[PDB]
Design a protein around this ligand. Structure first.
Ligand SMILES: Cn1c(=O)[nH]c2c(=O)[nH]c(=O)[nH]c21
Ligand SMILES: Cn1c(=O)[nH]c2c(=O)[nH]c(=O)[nH]c21
Ligand SMILES: Cn1c(=O)[nH]c2c(=O)[nH]c(=O)[nH]c21
Ligand SMILES: Cn1c(=O)[nH]c2c(=O)[nH]c(=O)[nH]c21
Lengths: 301, 301, 301, 301
């Protein structure tokens, strides 16, 4: 037997950080959950009970809090890059650091139409995430994402012209409800190290804002032919707006709202143009995925 | 053996309703989860296998969708009162209907600074709830609530002067983080029937809006002496603003954010006035409850 | 405004305790989650920012661990009674202690057909719970429960003879799947204090075992006319087997398994006597409740 | 823009199947949740609103129930292989089918020491899973797993000799609690098609049973030097017992149980050899992973 793959460390590390402007009294909070898993010359911990190669997960936890004390926690792409770089530089025998960060929403409260200096509301369970893989000799691979963005449109969704055979019962529709939970990931060009990540810092918040804006506007305005066709338009617009992105991935459930035939009861009309009351279906659901990149096809376009 | 208490019916009934203004094209959606449990002369279903006294839960489910088709679903206090009244009036042997409704947020999307006619966002897992108990011969008892409103303030919370004995380790503080999930319930005066509920319909949305506004402003502006003292101020202001409320109940967890002593590492200062990085605690938590009503004490005030 | 009701304390306190037989090497573990809420002369903490009347929830947490160190944690009815009594005796101004305990399963592992001395498995998310209300001057009110016991029978469940009117679509059945999550509560006679609870200690484990045995055997052997009729038989047998119980309460969801008509596909027969493949429904569900006590009817039985 | 990756279909499809021995009256139930995602010449559904290439997820759902009606659902490796093969054979333009199955426990009830013919208990939320990737021209890749197996040992776990530097606070221990949720995956040799999967059918149940037995016995008997060292022993034994497995992967959280120093209270001794009461930590947790395969190193072993 031999170790083909190994990583270890600490998961579910909750972190809060406050910034206090002593001049204005304005406070700003940041809250996240962090996972750090290390790789390197660690196989003997598995094979030989050699704990000398283990940077204790407790120590990794201490290091997350120390890094957050001594560095910005925003944008999360930067914080993740700083943290991962620390582990591969500090420890000769550690050759990769895998940093996952989930960012929790704390939106400043408006009280009597004025922003409150130190009060916040969890305005959505929507998250902003990063996956930062720091690989010694191979730079920094960053995937940025928004997840748990739950949306619904009551019309301007269609689904007709799909394959029909002996397995098919679904009726074509020219007007249905569309509801999803948006998981959208943008994959950055490889960065050579922390200096190159730092040189692009304003692009992280800007690209997250673009991804969210494009997701909401496209969902709201596309007279959707399918989830497939709608998500492709979101991905192509985000790629057009940030050249340092290589790919945009969407993973979208089709959260069904079924019509309810009430015609058995006093001839009530609640289908088609008369549909007012629907049954939201918890399961099953459609699931639609794609990864969009830029073309290099020159023939048979 | 004898039946001391019994109720039965249908839980977790997901309901969506759309309103379509054909003039403006503006669509408005409502989504809820409904539970209806009936009481009455039903003991023989338990004791004698007498199913003749059971209004099938499947039929109760059909009735929820039919009621939603033929009546407003908003405010939920009205929808609940209509539904509960239907069961005690339709069925001679049914003497109480217990209607619980959870209302899910679908907030209209703003696209390029304009409200979209048919696109919505789940802007919070915060709920608006009702419990409506329709009791034949005893009218309609309504409890209204907001739940899952998650808030945090980074300063202007204190906790000192508490009892200290041989069980006490907690340090007094003059500056801590306060974070909670707000569960706030307002209990209406008994209504004689559906006509009296209908006569007060505008008060339901107005009182929910008042409860939320008072909760947010008080949380944000109170230099809090304790969760106890802060919630009491919220409850007294809501009672002052709606005479048809008898009681206001709060149930608030104290969701702890602990300081992290980093002085063992390079003398880093992260406690007291230098506290920037905190550890959010998932459990345990403080839990603080109270029900506030109006006084009738004339002596020893 | 005046305080009509108030309680406060600590929730979600996770507790583990190990017993080590040094003679045999056999270790036994206990794991629970504890909530303690106090009542008494505490209104000034709410009305006057008077923290002198608050036994800090942090101190209540310390007290749970100290009690567990100095006393048995089993049966949970005893541990809860000890803990609640401590608060009303130690603090003159505290007049009630509300102790909720959830007990988590750690079942000894059998390895090569022999019980392992120190290895355990979470063999079910089924819980054993207590609610212990210690009220100064009014003794100790205990409710014991089992919850999250998930069961299914594939036949010997029926549902016919229910009310049929213009709201009814459900077909009568003489053979259906029955599946539920069992919540069963037994309410003890009021105990005068801790001495009387201690005098009955063996009855707590014995009555929990009886409730579980009766629940499983009745579910498995009753050719069920309805959930109502089946749960009534469980409750009456548990009352017959423990005179110190006053009431037995069941709360049972009817977790539906729907037939799937496949006759549209190659005439496949999958309904009635040919039903093999079913669709489990996550929601909605039936919900059936009753509280059974002993009779004192002497006429019109 | 161009489609670099795409799949779509149906998730969260709950399936139940009953087998009825008419001779013995013995019934056997199977319950699972199924996901099927297809790949192939489907990019035009994304780029051109061409729904002609979509096998509707509703049709995929119908096909799961039809397959379950016409074929064994056990072992899940076989059911998954049948289902995936159907999609790549039926549809010329579909070139891969990705089938994920979660199997839910329904263990036969023993009533009065005899197995009941038609009553079952969810004896654990532990799952048995498969991932079956059917790739046209490349056969059938199967990963089998057990997940959610929650275990604890109260002693015979150690953690000492780990790296100590300026980030390290953790104390070495020679006796701690070890608790985890076991996620164990075994990767099968590539199968050429459905005939080769069928030729190995008895190996699926046997290898799952081996993986579980080895996991439980090793956890219980290993005087653990670390999670790393313990999981490596499990993986090497499972590889030794099934030559058709290429790799065994473990993913194990270290679910911490912290000692509680009570010496501040009446000198109570609850640490080290006197530790009886512990605080289970919900988060953070250690996370330890490895993939073990067979060696081909001939030098520098
Ligand atoms: C309703 N529906 C299916 O059944 N499949 C699909 C699909 O892949 N995409 C859709 O937009 N809708 C839909
Ligand atoms: C921190 N803290 C306790 O320990 N108990 C209590 C309490 O009841 N109320 C608070 O506001 N804080 C607090
Ligand atoms: C299927 N079904 C209903 O619709 N209602 C009821 C009920 O109250 N009890 C049952 O056992 N089944 C059932
Ligand atoms: C307690 N502890 C750490 O902090 N890290 C680790 C690790 O990787 N492995 C362990 O078994 N324990 C442990």
């Amino acid at each position: 037997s031999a170790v083909k793959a190994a990583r270890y460390g600490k998961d579910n590390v909750r972190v809060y950080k406050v910034h206090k402007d002593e001049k204005t009294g304005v406070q700003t909070v940041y809250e996240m959950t962090v996972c750090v898993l290390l790789e390197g010359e660690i196989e003997t911990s598995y094979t030989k009970a050699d704990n000398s190669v283990i940077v204790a997960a407790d120590s990794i936890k201490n290091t997350i809090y120390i890094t957050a004390k001594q560095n910005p926690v925003t944008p999360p792409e930067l914080f993740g890059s700083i943290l991962g770089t620390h582990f591969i530089e500090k420890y000769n025998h550690i050759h990769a650091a895998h940093v996952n960060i989930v960012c929790h929403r704390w939106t400043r409260m408006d009280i009597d139409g004025k922003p409150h200096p130190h009060s916040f509301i969890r305005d959505s369970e929507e998250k902003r995430n990063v996956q930062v893989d720091v690989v010694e000799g191979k730079g920094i691979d960053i995937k940025s994402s928004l997840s748990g963005l739950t949306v619904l449109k009551s019309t301007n969704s269609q689904f007709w012209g799909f394959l029909r055979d002996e397995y098919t019962t679904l009726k074509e529709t020219w007007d249905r409800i569309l509801s999803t939970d948006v998981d959208a990931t943008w994959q950055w060009k490889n960065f050579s190290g922390l200096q190159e990540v730092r040189s692009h810092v304003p692009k992280f918040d800007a690209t997250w804002a673009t991804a969210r804006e494009v997701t909401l506007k496209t969902f709201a305005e596309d007279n959707s032919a399918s989830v497939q066709a709608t998500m492709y338009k979101m991905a192509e617009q985000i790629l057009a707006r940030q050249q340092l992105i290589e790919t945009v991935e969407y993973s979208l459930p089709n959260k069904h709202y079924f019509e309810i035939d009430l015609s058995w009861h006093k001839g009530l009309q609640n289908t088609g143009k008369n549909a007012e009351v629907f049954a939201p279906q918890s399961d099953p659901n459609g699931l639609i995925k794609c990864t969009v990149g830029r073309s290099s096809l020159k023939s048979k376009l």
